Amino acid sequence: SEPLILDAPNADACIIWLHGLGADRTDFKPVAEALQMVLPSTRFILPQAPSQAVTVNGGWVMPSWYDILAFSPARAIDEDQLNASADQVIALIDEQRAKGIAAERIILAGFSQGGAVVLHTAFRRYAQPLGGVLALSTYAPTFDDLALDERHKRIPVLHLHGSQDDVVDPALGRAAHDALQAQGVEVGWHDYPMGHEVSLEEIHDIGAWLRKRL
Predict the structure, then answer these.
(1) Where is each Phospholipase/carboxylesterase/thioesterase domain found (predicted)?
(2) CA distances from 26 to 44, 128, 130 (A)
């Protein structure tokens, strides 16, 4: 479908947030609207993953960024749908660049599956620098292969996770963090007593990090 947008008067920054497996672009609207209050000059773009069959879920057709062929291992995914979606974001990125929004003031964000997609996008597909990346309860199914150039290390990152996350092993979560970290990328970590979800304290953390960068 089409990206739900939360514009901001005289915009000078943009945050592209992606949802989890099988969710509505409206899932992060309440969060977008709130962060917009601390960042009133920042536009929010919440795209919609298309409907695709999800192998690991029989073959149900729901919003999926990439097909997940099995709960295990991590790589057990359709890498091309992943590259497809990534391109959907790279699309969105450029559009913003066109409307005059600056690179360092463009940020990608993703929860669960979505985070994989943006993590992949920033450090594997997109060639130009970004302003940052937000990883909400995720993993990086495509990081085993990683050799960042001098520029992609300039991309600050913040990883967040629930300790009780019984959907995305926190380990795979730190993993992504440790992967980027080891290549010398400015990264941050925050876990919370919660499961595959978002928390108020977590958002304050996100907003704070943002206020410092936008």
Answers:
(1) 11-212
(2) 12, 28, 24
